[PDB]
Amino acid sequence: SIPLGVIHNSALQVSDVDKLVCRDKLSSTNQLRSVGLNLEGNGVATDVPSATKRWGFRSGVPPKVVNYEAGEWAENCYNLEIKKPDGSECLPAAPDGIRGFPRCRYVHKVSGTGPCAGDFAFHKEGAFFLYDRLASTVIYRGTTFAEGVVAFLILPQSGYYSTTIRYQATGFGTNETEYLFEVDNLTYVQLESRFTPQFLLQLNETIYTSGKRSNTTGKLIWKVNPEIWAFWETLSFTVVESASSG
Amino acid sequence: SIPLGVIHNSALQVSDVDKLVCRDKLSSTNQLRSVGLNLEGNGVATDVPSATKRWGFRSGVPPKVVNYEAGEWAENCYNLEIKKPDGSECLPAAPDGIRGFPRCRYVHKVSGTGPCAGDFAFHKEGAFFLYDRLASTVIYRGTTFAEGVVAFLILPQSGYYSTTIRYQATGFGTNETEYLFEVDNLTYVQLESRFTPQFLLQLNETIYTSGKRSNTTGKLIWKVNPEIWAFWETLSFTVVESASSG
Amino acid sequence: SIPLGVIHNSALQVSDVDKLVCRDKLSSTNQLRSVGLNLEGNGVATDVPSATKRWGFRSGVPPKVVNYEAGEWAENCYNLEIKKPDGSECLPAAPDGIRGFPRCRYVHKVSGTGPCAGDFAFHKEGAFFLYDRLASTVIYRGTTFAEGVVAFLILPQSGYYSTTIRYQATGFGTNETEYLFEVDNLTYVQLESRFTPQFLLQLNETIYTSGKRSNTTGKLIWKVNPEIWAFWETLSFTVVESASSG
Amino acid sequence: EAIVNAQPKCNPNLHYWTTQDEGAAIGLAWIPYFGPAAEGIYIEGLMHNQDGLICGLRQLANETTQALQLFLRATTELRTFSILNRKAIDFLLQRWGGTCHILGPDCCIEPADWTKNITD
Amino acid sequence: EAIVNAQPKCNPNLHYWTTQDEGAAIGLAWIPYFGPAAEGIYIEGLMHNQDGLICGLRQLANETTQALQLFLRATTELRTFSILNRKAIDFLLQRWGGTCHILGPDCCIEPADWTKNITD
Amino acid sequence: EAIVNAQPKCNPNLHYWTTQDEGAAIGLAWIPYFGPAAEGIYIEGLMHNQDGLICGLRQLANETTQALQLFLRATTELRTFSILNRKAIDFLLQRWGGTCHILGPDCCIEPADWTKNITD
Ligand SMILES: *[C@@H]1O[C@H](CO)[C@@H](O[C@@H]2O[C@H](CO)[C@@H](O[C@@H]3O[C@H](CO[C@H]4O[C@H](CO)[C@@H](O)[C@H](O)[C@@H]4O)[C@@H](O)[C@H](O)[C@@H]3O)[C@H](O)[C@H]2NC(C)=O)[C@H](O)[C@H]1NC(C)=O
Ligand SMILES: *[C@@H]1O[C@H](CO)[C@@H](O[C@@H]2O[C@H](CO)[C@@H](O[C@@H]3O[C@H](CO[C@H]4O[C@H](CO)[C@@H](O)[C@H](O)[C@@H]4O)[C@@H](O)[C@H](O)[C@@H]3O)[C@H](O)[C@H]2NC(C)=O)[C@H](O)[C@H]1NC(C)=O
Ligand SMILES: *[C@@H]1O[C@H](CO)[C@@H](O[C@@H]2O[C@H](CO)[C@@H](O[C@@H]3O[C@H](CO[C@H]4O[C@H](CO)[C@@H](O)[C@H](O)[C@@H]4O)[C@@H](O)[C@H](O)[C@@H]3O)[C@H](O)[C@H]2NC(C)=O)[C@H](O)[C@H]1NC(C)=O
Ligand SMILES: CC/C(=C(\c1ccccc1)c1ccc(OCCN(C)C)cc1)c1cccc(NS(=O)(=O)N[C@@H]2CCOC2)c1
Ligand SMILES: CC/C(=C(\c1ccccc1)c1ccc(OCCN(C)C)cc1)c1cccc(NS(=O)(=O)N[C@@H]2CCOC2)c1
Ligand SMILES: CC/C(=C(\c1ccccc1)c1ccc(OCCN(C)C)cc1)c1cccc(NS(=O)(=O)N[C@@H]2CCOC2)c1
Ligand SMILES: *[C@@H]1O[C@H](CO)[C@@H](O)[C@H](O)[C@H]1NC(C)=O
Ligand SMILES: *[C@@H]1O[C@H](CO)[C@@H](O)[C@H](O)[C@H]1NC(C)=O
Ligand SMILES: *[C@@H]1O[C@H](CO)[C@@H](O)[C@H](O)[C@H]1NC(C)=O
Ligand SMILES: *[C@@H]1O[C@H](CO)[C@@H](O)[C@H](O)[C@H]1NC(C)=O
Ligand SMILES: *[C@@H]1O[C@H](CO)[C@@H](O)[C@H](O)[C@H]1NC(C)=O
Ligand SMILES: *[C@@H]1O[C@H](CO)[C@@H](O)[C@H](O)[C@H]1NC(C)=O
Ligand SMILES: *[C@@H]1O[C@H](CO)[C@@H](O)[C@H](O)[C@H]1NC(C)=O
Ligand SMILES: *[C@@H]1O[C@H](CO)[C@@H](O)[C@H](O)[C@H]1NC(C)=O
Ligand SMILES: *[C@@H]1O[C@H](CO)[C@@H](O)[C@H](O)[C@H]1NC(C)=O
Ligand SMILES: *[C@@H]1O[C@H](CO)[C@@H](O)[C@H](O)[C@H]1NC(C)=O
Ligand SMILES: *[C@@H]1O[C@H](CO)[C@@H](O)[C@H](O)[C@H]1NC(C)=O
Ligand SMILES: *[C@@H]1O[C@H](CO)[C@@H](O)[C@H](O)[C@H]1NC(C)=O
């Protein structure tokens, strides 16, 4: 059955209602809580190339939604808008009443294309996509989510800032996927797994503050050369339209 | 928490389940009741100009629906069909399973236009719009509702006639709203807050029974001169196309 | 109230929770079960002409759905695709989350036309249409269902093969309905109530295995002459484009 | 708390409509195909202001609104049907959610009928 | 009441399908991306007419229909999932919804094991 | 069973968001037309790893996933809101679903305060 978290002897333990002694008192449903916990807290890689490999398309499995009452402030969230090469949408529109995750420091918005060989996009490790107090087994189009898992417990009786980071993708959800961090509609940077959100923000600031944006109508793509842990515990520009940035 | 109505010492009192003594017996869920009560019973003005000022448009707030098992026969209900000046609908279509209020003596059907500066129309005093055993925080297009409020209780262990009264409105939901009672598609009466439903019905009868309807293809609008309480406790025609009716 | 099945003195009895003695022990909700039972088990005629007469169209009654946890392997199921003569669909598309019945030996798929004098198709005997763990009062377009009924109980503390049999109908849901068993898009057999699914399958095999299919582009319709119980307890071809098959 | 009606008016009479769940049928009327339409499923009753019940009831619904609206704001269910069920559970938890200490004010066990059996 | 089967026939055998909620997984089969499709989530069983259970069960479902349909007419929920939960609550209220009078027919408290402790 | 955190990392601090159901209003803020939008209904709190609660909590949610996913596979509800209510009912049934035998390990009735009243 679904496990239940109860504190005994100053330690959190799993014990369902059938395994409770008479000393345990449940005086109202208010003591019962459903909570959502972010995969970030377990040390998973939260960069866009790593996160997307954890998601895949599948058919024949109906989506399911379960609610939770309280969640964790996230550092990294994701907002996907993916189409097939012929232009058809890959992800379903968000059902009525399903809003994005309410607390994200960085929202990684990804627009791109891929084969999308499946009706719905699931989590390959079995985790959930956390929306506003609703957890789904599938990804919804254009809706901010955090990867996470749900717990159920018996209880014993700085402002909010969000920054959007935009990416372009080709061959999404495949063994050969390419990403570009977007500075504007015509200026892009080739993206690597090492690039933290703070590094991307400072890269964007540097490019703007001294004039590396595309001054033509063509697509200017930069590159950060290789010469350049957990979030809670912590240059020269040349053009070779590809380019380089030591 | 949500208050609960229980009879103690021959008087209705508010006392939640945590404030109940052992003398109180709850032998089945049948003793638990959710009921809807009409704002009319509190003495609010139920004429169309007064009722509409209690409703306003707002965005950013998701609608919510709660059910109730039993309601009160109403004298006045409302059925709104409002569009913006460019013709787009202002109110959402009724969701599946939401029907109109089942007992109305007079249904005030209002068709008109307004700016509609908001996604949904709410009750400015925080009351609910009562539909068929469903209470909503928002108004649905073309669906008969009664203004009301919901109570929850612990219980101790003449045919139906409905008449539709049609109105036209301009500048709906604003500080400058005008209404016209409709006699047919081309005959109208300027409406005032003093006009009771019975007065409107007798006005409609009088206009028909002796021939004051528009005998042209133009819009004939009448006016009742100023020289002409609770529902449970109770002429010469000239034309000046405006007109007058002493 | 809704009856409840409890075993007392080695016999199944109907007794609601208010009629239970202290000897009866309910230690978890797992002991509570909702089950679906097929009308076939009661000996009803399951041929297409007999089954369809038990269904009729009606308006003014909202559909309702109730769930059940376990069902019975059926021998006969039905999948209806009916349009009005002008081509408009008669049955609603299946709502989200409502799939067909999971265990059918024979699925009688019927495509045809009829007046469809009603918004929804109900069961005239008050039974339910059983879908995948959901029981409805109405038929959904193109969705496999079994006729059945639901029970609620307190518990005391060979592969799956499915064959589709296709039919054409004219004047569906009327006192004058005609059916044709379909062999291909141009070869048909006039259908009679006596024709069992196994007989139809062997008829289809016989027609194929020696060449009675329509070898033109016209509609070839056969007929089985009259000279030719429960499922759990058990030729010359001439053409007169009508025909005969002794 | 006691309910004090603070409304400009109170209709002391309650002409109500509801549905009969048990709805003892007459022949085939229970079959949805033969039964009433959505408009004809209602029964009615009339209730006068005995014990001041009606006027208290109107005031109670007025005062319930704030807590009800705050509950609806905090929930993600589009249509809420389970408020009364959750209050029945809370009723039982308040009394039987822990160990029942006989003769305690919070334990609803009366040993009187049997406490004589021992002393006899 | 006792269940009297009044049907023209009764299939005495019940070949049933259901789902395994506990569904003890084999490796990664519990992950929806790797697990079975909607068509392959079912287990099966066979049950014979011991105690006349199957024939009584078919009759019980037939007789449940009228009350079930009247309940569905009176409800506004499009899909009803809470009938069994509400009956579990009603089960507890019937026994524990009031003061329990020991040695009363309506109080399910047996003092026998401890009534010897006092008289010993 | 005890919870053993088997994760590569554990953020020992929990910066959480939730909603205030009681949400004691300030004037007209409870009225949906005047109240906050969907983005401003949240309260926040900070919780440190006392008793190892946070690290155990992350491990508990990780281990809940398999049973939760299997439950969601077997259900036909599109959105499940009743897991905690059904566990409150199961809590009461485990203790009060049968006859309570006083001084039995499975009966949560303490007669101590009154067993002195008889012997005095
Ligand atoms: C609860 O936490 C567990 C521990 O963090 C989670 O286990 C994860 O399970 C997924 C699959 O569901 C694994 O991803 C696959 O793993 C294997 C290869 O094993 C990995 O071994 C080490 C472990 O760190 C790693 O360095 C290797 O690169 C491999 O990735 C292959 O099938 C695939 O390549 C794929 O990566 C995770 O690796 C695994 N994590 C760990 C740390 O072992 C478990 O999913 C969580 N439960 C949930 C979310 O419900
Ligand atoms: C429960 O019943 C209460 C008493 O009937 C309801 O109080 C009403 O609250 C609304 C706002 O939610 C008020 O409307 C606004 O009121 C003020 C001005 O105050 C009024 O003062 C007197 C009272 O009769 C009146 O004569 C004046 O003209 C004012 O209207 C301004 O903000 C606005 O103009 C607006 O009208 C109602 O006036 C007030 N009614 C009374 C009788 O005081 C309360 O809403 C109910 N609770 C619900 C429905 O959940
Ligand atoms: C529970 O089982 C009952 C017994 O099987 C079901 O009773 C069936 O009720 C339907 C109507 O709801 C009847 O159909 C109509 O019946 C009458 C004529 O009576 C029939 O009499 C005998 C009975 O076998 C039969 O030989 C005749 O031909 C008649 O059909 C007329 O109104 C219509 O023609 C129509 O056929 C069934 O006949 C009746 N069955 C039996 C065996 O009596 C009952 O519906 C079940 N409850 C459910 C499904 O909720
Ligand atoms: C573990 C954190 C937590 C969470 C939580 C949140 C997110 C993710 C994981 C766990 C929690 C907070 C509020 C919840 O729901 C409130 C709204 N509800 C009416 C619908 C549910 C879970 C929480 C739990 C209970 C009480 C309080 N506060 S406290 O100051 O008393 N400290 C007490 C002293 C002993 O352990 C805590 C905070
Ligand atoms: C206060 C009126 C009322 C209402 C009510 C209705 C509308 C608005 C406000 C209050 C009520 C009636 C029926 C209800 O639900 C029935 C269907 N349910 C199975 C889903 C709920 C509330 C009602 C309540 C209980 C019993 C009866 N009748 S009585 O003759 O026994 N008189 C008893 C003697 C002592 O106080 C009443 C009528
Ligand atoms: C009567 C058949 C049945 C049904 C049933 C199924 C379909 C139609 C009519 C009745 C049944 C089976 C499983 C159910 O739900 C499981 C999933 N749930 C977690 C959501 C519900 C009903 C069933 C019931 C209980 C236990 C077992 N097996 S047994 O081997 O122990 N034999 C025991 C020994 C005493 O009587 C049975 C099978
Ligand atoms: C993706 O490409 C790599 C290249 O090394 C190959 O080994 C792998 O099998 C490919 N994946 C699929 C699913 O074809
Ligand atoms: C950048 O592209 C997006 C996506 O097409 C578009 O909505 C936006 O207006 C563009 N911005 C500028 C400054 O051109
Ligand atoms: C990049 O920097 C510019 C200039 O400060 C700013 O307007 C823009 O929002 C930044 N973009 C991101 C994604 O932070
Ligand atoms: C124009 O763009 C180039 C890259 O193509 C960049 O190196 C250069 O600094 C830009 N010049 C100005 C004047 O902004
Ligand atoms: C509506 O018009 C009146 C005219 O007296 C004015 O006082 C009021 O402010 C106006 N309301 C709004 C919302 O502009
Ligand atoms: C009056 O106008 C309404 C709304 O356009 C229309 O449906 C109705 O047929 C008209 N009636 C007559 C008698 O012209
Ligand atoms: C007005 O009176 C006419 C004539 O009796 C009648 O047909 C019509 O329905 C009445 N209209 C209303 C709104 O009562
Ligand atoms: C024609 O309409 C006028 C108002 O324009 C009205 O006063 C008059 O009585 C009507 N005449 C007839 C003959 O109906
Ligand atoms: C159908 O036709 C038959 C022919 O015998 C007739 O008796 C019956 O009344 C007809 N049914 C209807 C509903 O008209
Ligand atoms: C038979 O007709 C159906 C329905 O139009 C069609 O889908 C199918 O392809 C046809 N089959 C053949 C073999 O022509
Ligand atoms: C009829 O027989 C043919 C030939 O064996 C087979 O392909 C076809 O599926 C059969 N049709 C049915 C409805 O069984
Ligand atoms: C051609 O079809 C006819 C029926 O029209 C059938 O009797 C005959 O056997 C078929 N001939 C061949 C050669 O298949």
Numbering used by the authors:
A (entry chain A), B (entry chain A), C (entry chain A): 32 to 188, 211 to 281, 288 to 293, 306 to 311, 472 to 477
D (entry chain B), E (entry chain B), F (entry chain B): 502 to 621
What sentences appear in the manuscript?
Here, we report on the optimization of tamoxifen, an EBOV-glycoprotein (GP) binder that inhibits viral entry, using our Sulfur-Fluoride Exchange (SuFEx) click chemistry-based high-throughput medicinal chemistry (HTMC) strategy. Importantly, the HTMC workflow enabled the discovery of an analog with a 50-fold improved binding affinity compared to tamoxifen.
Interestingly, the S-configured compound (4S) exhibited a superior EC50 value of 92 nM, compared to its R-counterpart (4R) of 351 nM, indicating the importance of the chirality on the improved potency and specific interaction with GP-protein. 4S displayed a stronger binding affinity against EBOV-GP, with a K D value of 0.63 µM, compared to 4R with a K D value of 6.4 µM. We then determined the X-ray structure of 4R in complex with EBOV-GP to 2.59 Å resolution. It adopts a similar pose to its analog, toremifene, with conserved interactions involving the three aromatic rings and the dimethylethanamine group of the parent scaffold. Compared to toremifene, 4R occupies a larger portion of the available cavity, with its additional moiety engaging a hydrophobic subpocket, potentially contributing to its improved binding. Unfortunately, we were unable to obtain a structure for 4S, as it renders the crystal unstable, possibly due to conformational changes when the compound is soaked into the crystal, and leads to poor diffraction. Structural analyses of toremifene bound to EBOV-GP have shown that this scaffold binds at the same site at the entrance of the binding pocket by expelling the DFF lid (residues 192–195) and positioning the A ring of the scaffold within this region. We propose that this flexible fragment could be modulating the enantioselectivity of the inhibitors identified in this work.
